[PDB]
mmCIF file of C-alpha atoms and ligand atoms in Angstrom:
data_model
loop_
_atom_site.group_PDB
_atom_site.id
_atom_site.type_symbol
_atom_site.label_atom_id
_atom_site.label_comp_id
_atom_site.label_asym_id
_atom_site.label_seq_id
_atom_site.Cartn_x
_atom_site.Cartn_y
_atom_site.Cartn_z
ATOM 1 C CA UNK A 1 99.702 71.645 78.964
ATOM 2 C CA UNK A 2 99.532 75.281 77.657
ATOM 3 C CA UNK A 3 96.425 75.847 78.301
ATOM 4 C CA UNK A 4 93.922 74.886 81.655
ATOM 5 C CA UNK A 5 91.112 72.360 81.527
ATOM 6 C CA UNK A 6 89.429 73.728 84.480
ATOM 7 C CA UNK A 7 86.204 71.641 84.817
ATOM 8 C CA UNK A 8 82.687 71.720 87.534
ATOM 9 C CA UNK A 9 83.855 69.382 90.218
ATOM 10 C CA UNK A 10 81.608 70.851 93.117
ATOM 11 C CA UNK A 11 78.916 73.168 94.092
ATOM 12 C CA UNK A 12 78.563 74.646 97.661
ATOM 13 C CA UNK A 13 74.803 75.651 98.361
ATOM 14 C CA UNK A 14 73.391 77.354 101.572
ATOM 15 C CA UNK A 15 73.739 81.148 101.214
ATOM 16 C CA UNK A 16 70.336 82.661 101.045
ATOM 17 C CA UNK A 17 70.957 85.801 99.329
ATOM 18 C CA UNK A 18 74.143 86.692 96.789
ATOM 19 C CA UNK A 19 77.738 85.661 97.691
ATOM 20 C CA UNK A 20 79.994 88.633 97.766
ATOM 21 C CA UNK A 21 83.286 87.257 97.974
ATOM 22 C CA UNK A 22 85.056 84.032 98.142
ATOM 23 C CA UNK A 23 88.747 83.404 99.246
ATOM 24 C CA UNK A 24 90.694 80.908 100.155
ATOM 25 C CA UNK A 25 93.123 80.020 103.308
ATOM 26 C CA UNK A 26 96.832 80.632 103.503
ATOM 27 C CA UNK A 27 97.264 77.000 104.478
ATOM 28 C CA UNK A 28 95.282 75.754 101.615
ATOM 29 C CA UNK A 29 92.640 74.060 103.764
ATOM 30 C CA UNK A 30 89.684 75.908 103.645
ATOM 31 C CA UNK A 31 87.481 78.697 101.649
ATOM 32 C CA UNK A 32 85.889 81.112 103.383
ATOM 33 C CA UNK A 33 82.617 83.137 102.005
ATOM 34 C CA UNK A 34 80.768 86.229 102.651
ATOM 35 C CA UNK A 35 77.062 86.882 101.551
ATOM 36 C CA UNK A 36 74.662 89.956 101.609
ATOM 37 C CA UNK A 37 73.076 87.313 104.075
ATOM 38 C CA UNK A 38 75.555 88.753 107.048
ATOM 39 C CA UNK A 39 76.725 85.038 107.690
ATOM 40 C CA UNK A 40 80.445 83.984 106.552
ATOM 41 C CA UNK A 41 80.754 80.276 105.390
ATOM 42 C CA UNK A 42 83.600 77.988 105.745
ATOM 43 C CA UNK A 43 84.327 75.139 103.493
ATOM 44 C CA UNK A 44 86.470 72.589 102.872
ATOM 45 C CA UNK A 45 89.147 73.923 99.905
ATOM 46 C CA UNK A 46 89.213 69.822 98.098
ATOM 47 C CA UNK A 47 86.055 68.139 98.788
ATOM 48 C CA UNK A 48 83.288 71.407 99.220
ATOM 49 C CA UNK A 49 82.269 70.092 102.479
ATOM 50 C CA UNK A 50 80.384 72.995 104.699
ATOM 51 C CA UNK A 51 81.992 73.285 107.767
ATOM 52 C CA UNK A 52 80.401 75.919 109.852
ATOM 53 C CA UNK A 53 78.608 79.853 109.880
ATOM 54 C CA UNK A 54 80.397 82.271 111.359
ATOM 55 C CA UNK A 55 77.494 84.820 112.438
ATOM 56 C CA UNK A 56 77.515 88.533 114.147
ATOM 57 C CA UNK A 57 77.091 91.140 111.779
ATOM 58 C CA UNK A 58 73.682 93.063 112.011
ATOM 59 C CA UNK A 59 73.455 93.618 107.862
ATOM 60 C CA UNK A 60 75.284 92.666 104.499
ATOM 61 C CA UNK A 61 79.095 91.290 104.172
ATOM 62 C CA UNK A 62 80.776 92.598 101.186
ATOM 63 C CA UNK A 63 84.231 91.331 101.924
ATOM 64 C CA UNK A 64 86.063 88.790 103.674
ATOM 65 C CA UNK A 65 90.084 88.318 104.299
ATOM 66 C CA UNK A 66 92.746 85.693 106.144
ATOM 67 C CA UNK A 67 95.625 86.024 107.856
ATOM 68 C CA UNK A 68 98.879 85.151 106.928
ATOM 69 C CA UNK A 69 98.593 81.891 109.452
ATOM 70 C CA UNK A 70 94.891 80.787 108.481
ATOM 71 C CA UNK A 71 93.699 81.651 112.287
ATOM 72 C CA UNK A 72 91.336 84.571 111.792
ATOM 73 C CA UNK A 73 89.133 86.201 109.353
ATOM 74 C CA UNK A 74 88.282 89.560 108.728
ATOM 75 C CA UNK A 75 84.354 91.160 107.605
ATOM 76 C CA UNK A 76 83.712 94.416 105.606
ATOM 77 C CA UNK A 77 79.921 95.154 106.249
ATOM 78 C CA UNK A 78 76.821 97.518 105.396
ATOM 79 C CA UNK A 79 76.590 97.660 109.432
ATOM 80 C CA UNK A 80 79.748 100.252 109.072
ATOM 81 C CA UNK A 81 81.999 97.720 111.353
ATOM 82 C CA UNK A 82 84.949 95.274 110.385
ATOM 83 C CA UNK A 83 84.597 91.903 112.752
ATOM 84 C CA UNK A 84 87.992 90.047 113.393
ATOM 85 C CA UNK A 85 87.299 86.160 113.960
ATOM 86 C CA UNK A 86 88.564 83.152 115.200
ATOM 87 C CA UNK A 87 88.269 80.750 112.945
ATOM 88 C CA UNK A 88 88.412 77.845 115.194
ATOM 89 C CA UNK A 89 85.983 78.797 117.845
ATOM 90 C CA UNK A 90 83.725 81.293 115.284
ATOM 91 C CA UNK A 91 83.919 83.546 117.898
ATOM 92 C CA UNK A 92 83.989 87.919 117.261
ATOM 93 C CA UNK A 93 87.213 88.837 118.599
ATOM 94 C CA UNK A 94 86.987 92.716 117.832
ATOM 95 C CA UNK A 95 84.566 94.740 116.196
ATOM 96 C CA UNK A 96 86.580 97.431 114.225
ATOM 97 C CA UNK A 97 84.076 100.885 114.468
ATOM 98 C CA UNK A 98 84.707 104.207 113.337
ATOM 99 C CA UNK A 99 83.425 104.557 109.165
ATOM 100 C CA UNK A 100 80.623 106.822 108.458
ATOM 101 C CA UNK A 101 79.321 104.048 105.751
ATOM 102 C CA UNK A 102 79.032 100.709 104.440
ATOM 103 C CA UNK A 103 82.662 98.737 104.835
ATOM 104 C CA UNK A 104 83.287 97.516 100.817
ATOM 105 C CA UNK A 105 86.832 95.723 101.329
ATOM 106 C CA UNK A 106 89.561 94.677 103.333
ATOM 107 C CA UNK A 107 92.374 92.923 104.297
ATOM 108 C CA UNK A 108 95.361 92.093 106.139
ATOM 109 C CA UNK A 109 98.750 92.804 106.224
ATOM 110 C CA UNK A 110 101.387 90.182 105.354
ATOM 111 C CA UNK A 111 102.751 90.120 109.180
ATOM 112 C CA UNK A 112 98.713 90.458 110.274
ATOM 113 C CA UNK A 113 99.251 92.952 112.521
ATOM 114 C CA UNK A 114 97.031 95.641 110.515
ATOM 115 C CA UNK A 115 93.816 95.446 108.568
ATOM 116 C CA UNK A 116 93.492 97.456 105.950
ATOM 117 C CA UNK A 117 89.436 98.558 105.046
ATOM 118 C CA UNK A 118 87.500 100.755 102.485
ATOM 119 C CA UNK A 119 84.645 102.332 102.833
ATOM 120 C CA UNK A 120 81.602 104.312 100.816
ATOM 121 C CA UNK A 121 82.379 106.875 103.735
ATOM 122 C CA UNK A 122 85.581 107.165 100.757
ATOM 123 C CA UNK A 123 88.362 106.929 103.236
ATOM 124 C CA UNK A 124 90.650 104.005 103.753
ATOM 125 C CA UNK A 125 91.350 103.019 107.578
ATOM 126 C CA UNK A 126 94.688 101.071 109.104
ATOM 127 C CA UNK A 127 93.883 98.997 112.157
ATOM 128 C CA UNK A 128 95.275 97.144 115.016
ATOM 129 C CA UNK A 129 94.894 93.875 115.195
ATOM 130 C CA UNK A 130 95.817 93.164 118.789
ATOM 131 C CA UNK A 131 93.885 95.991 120.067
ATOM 132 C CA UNK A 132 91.095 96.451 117.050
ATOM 133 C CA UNK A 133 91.864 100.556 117.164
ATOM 134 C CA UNK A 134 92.122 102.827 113.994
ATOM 135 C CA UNK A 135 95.854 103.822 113.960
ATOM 136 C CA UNK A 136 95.135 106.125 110.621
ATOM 137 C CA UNK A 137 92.354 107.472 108.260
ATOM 138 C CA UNK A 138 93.106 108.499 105.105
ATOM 139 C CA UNK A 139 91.518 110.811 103.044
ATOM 140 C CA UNK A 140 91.858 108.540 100.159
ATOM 141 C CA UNK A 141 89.726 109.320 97.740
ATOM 142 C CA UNK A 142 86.382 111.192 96.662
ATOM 143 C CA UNK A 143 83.789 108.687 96.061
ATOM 144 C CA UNK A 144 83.079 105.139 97.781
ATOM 145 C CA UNK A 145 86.743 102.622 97.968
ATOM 146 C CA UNK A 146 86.385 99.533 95.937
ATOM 147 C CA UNK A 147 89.399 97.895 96.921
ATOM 148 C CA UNK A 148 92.326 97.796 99.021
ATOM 149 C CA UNK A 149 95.571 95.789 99.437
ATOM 150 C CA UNK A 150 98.998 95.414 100.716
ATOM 151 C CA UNK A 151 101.854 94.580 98.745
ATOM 152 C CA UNK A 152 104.446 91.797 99.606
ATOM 153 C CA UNK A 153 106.479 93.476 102.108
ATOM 154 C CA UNK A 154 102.947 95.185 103.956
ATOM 155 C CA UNK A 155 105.409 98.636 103.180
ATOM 156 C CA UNK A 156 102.632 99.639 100.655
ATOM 157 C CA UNK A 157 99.001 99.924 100.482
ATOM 158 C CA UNK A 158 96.604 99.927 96.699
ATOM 159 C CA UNK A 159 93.435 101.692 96.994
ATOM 160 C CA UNK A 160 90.877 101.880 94.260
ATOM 161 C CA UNK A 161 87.507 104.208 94.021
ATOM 162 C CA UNK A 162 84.845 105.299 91.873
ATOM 163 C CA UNK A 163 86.339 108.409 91.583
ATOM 164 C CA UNK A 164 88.450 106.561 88.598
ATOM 165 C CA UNK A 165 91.615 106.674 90.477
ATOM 166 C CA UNK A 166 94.349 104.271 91.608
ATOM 167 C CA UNK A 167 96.995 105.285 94.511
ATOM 168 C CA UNK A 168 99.379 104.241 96.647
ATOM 169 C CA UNK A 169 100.095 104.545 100.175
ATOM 170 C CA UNK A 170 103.378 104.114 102.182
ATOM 171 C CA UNK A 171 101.630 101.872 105.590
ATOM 172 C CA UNK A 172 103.951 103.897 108.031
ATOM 173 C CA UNK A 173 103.054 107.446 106.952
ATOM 174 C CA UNK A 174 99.468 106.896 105.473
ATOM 175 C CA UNK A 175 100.660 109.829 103.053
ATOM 176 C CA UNK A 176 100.410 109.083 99.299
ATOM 177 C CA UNK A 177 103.101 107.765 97.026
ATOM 178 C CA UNK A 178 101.886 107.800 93.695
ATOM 179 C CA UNK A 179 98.247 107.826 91.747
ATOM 180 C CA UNK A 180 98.913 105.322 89.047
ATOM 181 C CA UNK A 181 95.879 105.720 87.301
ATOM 182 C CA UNK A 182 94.275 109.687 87.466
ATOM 183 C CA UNK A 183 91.240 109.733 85.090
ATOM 184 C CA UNK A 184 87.783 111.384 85.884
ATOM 185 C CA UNK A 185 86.479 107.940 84.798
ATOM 186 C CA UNK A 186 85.710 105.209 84.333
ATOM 187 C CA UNK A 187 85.087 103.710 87.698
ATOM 188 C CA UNK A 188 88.129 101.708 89.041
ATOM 189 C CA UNK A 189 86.173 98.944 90.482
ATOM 190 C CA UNK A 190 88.797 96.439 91.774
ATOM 191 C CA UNK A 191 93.110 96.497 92.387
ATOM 192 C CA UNK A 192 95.903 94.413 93.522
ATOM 193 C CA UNK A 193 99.332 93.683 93.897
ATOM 194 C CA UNK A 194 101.134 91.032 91.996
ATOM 195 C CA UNK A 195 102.465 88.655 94.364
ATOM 196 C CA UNK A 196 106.257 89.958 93.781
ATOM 197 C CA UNK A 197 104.312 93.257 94.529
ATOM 198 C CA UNK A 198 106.041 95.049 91.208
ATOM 199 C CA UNK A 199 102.394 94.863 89.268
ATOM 200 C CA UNK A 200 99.066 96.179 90.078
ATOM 201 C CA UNK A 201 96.066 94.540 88.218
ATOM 202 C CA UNK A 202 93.235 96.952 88.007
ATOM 203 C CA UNK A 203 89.595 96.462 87.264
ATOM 204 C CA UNK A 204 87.630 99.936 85.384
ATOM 205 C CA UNK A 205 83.755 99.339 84.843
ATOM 206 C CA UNK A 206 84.841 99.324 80.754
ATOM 207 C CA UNK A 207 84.812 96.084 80.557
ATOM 208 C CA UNK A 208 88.514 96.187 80.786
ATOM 209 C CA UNK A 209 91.872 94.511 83.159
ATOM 210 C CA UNK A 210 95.043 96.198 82.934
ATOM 211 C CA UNK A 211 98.207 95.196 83.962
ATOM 212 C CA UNK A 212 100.396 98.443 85.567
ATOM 213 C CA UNK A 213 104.254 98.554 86.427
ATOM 214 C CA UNK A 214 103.954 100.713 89.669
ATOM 215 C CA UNK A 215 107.692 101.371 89.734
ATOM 216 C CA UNK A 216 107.533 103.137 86.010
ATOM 217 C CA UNK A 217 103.974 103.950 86.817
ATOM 218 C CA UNK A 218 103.105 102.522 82.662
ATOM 219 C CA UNK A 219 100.431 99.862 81.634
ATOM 220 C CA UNK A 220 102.048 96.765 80.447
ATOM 221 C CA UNK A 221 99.168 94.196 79.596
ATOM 222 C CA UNK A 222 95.536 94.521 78.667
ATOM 223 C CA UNK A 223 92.790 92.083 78.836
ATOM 224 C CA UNK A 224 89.632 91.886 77.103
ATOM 225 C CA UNK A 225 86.533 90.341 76.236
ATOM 226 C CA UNK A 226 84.985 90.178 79.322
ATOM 227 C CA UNK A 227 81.841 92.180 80.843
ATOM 228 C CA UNK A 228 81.877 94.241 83.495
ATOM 229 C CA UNK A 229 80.309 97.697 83.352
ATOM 230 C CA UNK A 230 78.606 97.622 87.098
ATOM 231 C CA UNK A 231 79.691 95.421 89.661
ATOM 232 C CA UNK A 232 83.501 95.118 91.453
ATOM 233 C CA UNK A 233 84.260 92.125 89.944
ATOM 234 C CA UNK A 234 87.668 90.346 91.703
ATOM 235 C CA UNK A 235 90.373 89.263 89.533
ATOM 236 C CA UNK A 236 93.408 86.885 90.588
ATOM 237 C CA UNK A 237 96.381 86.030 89.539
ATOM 238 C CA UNK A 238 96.903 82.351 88.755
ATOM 239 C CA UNK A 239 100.770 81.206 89.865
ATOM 240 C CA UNK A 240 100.043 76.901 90.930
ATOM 241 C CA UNK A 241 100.507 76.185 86.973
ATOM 242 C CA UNK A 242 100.058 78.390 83.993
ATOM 243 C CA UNK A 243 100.209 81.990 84.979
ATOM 244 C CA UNK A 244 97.244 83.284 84.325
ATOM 245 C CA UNK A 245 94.209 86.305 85.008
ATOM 246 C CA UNK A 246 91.449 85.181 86.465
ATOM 247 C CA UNK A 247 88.174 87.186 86.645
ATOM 248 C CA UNK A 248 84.749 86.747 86.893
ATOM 249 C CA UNK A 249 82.229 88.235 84.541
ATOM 250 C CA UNK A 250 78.406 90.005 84.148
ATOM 251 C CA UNK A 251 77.982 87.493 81.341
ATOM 252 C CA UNK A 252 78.062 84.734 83.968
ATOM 253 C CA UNK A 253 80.789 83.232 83.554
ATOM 254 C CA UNK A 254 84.258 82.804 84.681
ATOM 255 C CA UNK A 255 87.555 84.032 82.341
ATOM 256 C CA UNK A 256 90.784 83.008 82.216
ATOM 257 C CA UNK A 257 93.465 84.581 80.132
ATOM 258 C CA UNK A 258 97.049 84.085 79.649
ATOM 259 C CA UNK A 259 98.960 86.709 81.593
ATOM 260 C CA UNK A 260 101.775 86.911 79.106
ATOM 261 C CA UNK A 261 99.788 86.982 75.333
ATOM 262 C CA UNK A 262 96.352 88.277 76.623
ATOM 263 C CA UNK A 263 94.806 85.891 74.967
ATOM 264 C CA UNK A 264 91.652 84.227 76.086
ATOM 265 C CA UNK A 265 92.400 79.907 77.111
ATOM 266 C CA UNK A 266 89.238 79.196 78.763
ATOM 267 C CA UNK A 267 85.603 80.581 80.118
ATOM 268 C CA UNK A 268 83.962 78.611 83.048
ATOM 269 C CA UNK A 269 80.029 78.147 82.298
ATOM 270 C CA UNK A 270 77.609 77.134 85.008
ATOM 271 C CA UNK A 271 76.493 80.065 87.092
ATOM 272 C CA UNK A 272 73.239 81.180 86.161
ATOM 273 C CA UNK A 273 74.289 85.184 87.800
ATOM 274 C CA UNK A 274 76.975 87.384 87.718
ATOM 275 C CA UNK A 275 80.382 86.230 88.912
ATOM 276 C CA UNK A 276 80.970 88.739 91.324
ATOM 277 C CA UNK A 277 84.127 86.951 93.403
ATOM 278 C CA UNK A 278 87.176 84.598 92.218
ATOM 279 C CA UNK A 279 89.660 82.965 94.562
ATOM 280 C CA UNK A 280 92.674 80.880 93.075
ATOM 281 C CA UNK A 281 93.872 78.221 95.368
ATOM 282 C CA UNK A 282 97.171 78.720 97.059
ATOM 283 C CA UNK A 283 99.169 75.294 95.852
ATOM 284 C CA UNK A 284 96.342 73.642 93.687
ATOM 285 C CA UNK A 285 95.348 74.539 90.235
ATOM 286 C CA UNK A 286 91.289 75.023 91.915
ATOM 287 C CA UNK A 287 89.306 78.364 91.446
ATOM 288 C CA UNK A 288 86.438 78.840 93.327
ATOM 289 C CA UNK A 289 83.844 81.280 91.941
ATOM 290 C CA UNK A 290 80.767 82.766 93.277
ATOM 291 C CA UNK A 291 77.826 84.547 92.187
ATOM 292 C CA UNK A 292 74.639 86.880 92.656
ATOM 293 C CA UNK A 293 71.279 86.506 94.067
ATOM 294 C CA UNK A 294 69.785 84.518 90.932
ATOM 295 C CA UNK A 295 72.414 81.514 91.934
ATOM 296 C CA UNK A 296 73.848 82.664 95.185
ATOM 297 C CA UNK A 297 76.073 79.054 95.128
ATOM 298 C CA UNK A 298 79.934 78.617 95.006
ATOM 299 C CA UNK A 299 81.712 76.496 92.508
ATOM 300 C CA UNK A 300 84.816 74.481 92.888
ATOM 301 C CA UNK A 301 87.251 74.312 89.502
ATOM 302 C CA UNK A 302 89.608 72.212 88.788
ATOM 303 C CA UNK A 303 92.067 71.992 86.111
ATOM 304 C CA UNK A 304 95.597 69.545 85.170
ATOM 305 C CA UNK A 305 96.807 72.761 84.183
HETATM 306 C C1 OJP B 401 78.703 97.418 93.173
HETATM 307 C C2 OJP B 401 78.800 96.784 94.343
HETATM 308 C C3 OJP B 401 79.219 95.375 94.258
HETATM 309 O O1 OJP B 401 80.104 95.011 93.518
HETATM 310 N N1 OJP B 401 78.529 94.533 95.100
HETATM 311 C C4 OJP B 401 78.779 93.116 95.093
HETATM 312 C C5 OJP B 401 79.268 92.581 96.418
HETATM 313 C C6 OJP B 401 80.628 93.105 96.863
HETATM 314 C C7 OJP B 401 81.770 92.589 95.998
HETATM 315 C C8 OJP B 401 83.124 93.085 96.384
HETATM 316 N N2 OJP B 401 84.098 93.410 95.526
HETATM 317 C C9 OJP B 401 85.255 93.821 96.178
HETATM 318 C C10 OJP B 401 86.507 94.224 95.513
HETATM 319 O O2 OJP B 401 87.440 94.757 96.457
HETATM 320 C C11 OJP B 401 84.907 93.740 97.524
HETATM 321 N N3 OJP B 401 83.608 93.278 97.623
#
């Protein structure tokens, strides 16, 4: 129908502290999360069913990422290091060092050769898979990185900060294309590319989702309704049925809107803490959501829809 029926159909317990980020794989199989815990959980994507920890870092995860063919993960944590993983075996294949801070977010490139990571230290670091060296730092911005993402083609990377800015970064030069958004504030506390990679959806902490043309560098769509004034909330775009914007919420819950309108066609009770992490499933119409320390669980959505 027009709108999604997204309803409860499983919740995934065992993280002892909050989740910070949920996503799931390439391949549709599995959902990977990350905790303040340090431990990464897998999970099966239909049926919830925990499938193993993935263990190594020495504090607090803040992001996890796949690649392209489901194989390996990537970690952003408070221990200042990126971990590259094989899924299979759980097994640290590199440990990605040179930040000055806590690593906030990451992810790879579409041909998952690089990793792209963001740190409080305020830069934004390319690596090598293969090898796990830093092949750039950029100066990227002046207060800690909230997000960071490559566009369809990996030619372009989307950086967001605290520092209330938006830019964008050609991969082969590191040197700056465009700032898309250039106020003092607010915060911009989460970005990405649309999956065509001609629209960047940006988070500010003003309770606020905005929809940007990069090429003409002009806000299209705005959504509202929502809270989020503190935390770097995820948002998604939904493309297995109705397109929608997915985000979570400080209010606890989970929002959907439709893309196209703006208007508001569902909100997701059952978390009992913020919704700090969204993942939309790759041919499915399933969201998983996660939440803070008061709930710490993951819940499995699913909608005709
Ligand atoms: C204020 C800090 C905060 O939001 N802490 C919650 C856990 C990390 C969530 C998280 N958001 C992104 C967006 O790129 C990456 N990781």
């Amino acid at each position: 129908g027009s709108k999604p029926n997204y309803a409860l159909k499983f919740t995934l317990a065992g993280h002892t502290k909050a989740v910070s980020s949920v996503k799931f794989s390439p391949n549709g199989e599995w959902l990977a999360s990350s905790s303040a815990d340090k431990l990464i959980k897998i999970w099966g994507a239909y049926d919830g069913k925990f499938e193993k920890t993935i263990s190594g870092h020495k504090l607090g995860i803040s992001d996890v990422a796949w690649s392209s063919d489901s194989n390996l993960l990537v970690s952003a944590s408070d221990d200042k290091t990126l971990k590259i993983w094989d899924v299979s075996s759980g097994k640290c294949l590199k440990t990605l060092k040179g930040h000055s801070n806590y690593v906030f977010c990451c992810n790879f490139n579409p041909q998952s050769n690089l990793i792209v990571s963001g740190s409080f230290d305020e830069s934004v670091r390319i690596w090598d898979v293969k090898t796990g060296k830093c092949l750039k730092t950029l100066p990227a911005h002046s207060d800690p990185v909230s997000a960071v993402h490559f566009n369809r083609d990996g030619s372009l990377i989307v950086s967001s900060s605290y520092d209330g800015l938006c830019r964008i970064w050609d991969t082969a030069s590191g040197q700056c294309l465009k700032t898309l958004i250039d106020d003092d504030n607010p915060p911009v506390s989460f970005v990405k590319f649309s999956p065509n990679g001609k629209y960047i959806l940006a988070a500010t902490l003003d309770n606020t989702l905005k929809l940007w043309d990069y090429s003409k560098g002009k806000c299209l769509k705005t959504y509202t309704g929502h809270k989020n004034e503190k935390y770097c909330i995820f948002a998604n775009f939904s493309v297995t049925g109705g397109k929608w914007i997915v985000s979570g919420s400080e209010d606890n819950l989970v929002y959907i809107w439709n893309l196209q309108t703006k208007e508001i066609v569902q909100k997701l009770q059952g978390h009992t803490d913020v919704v700090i992490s969204t993942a939309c499933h790759p041919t499915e119409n399933i969201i998983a959501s996660a939440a803070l320390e008061n709930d710490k669980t993951i819940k499995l959505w699913k909608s005709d829809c």
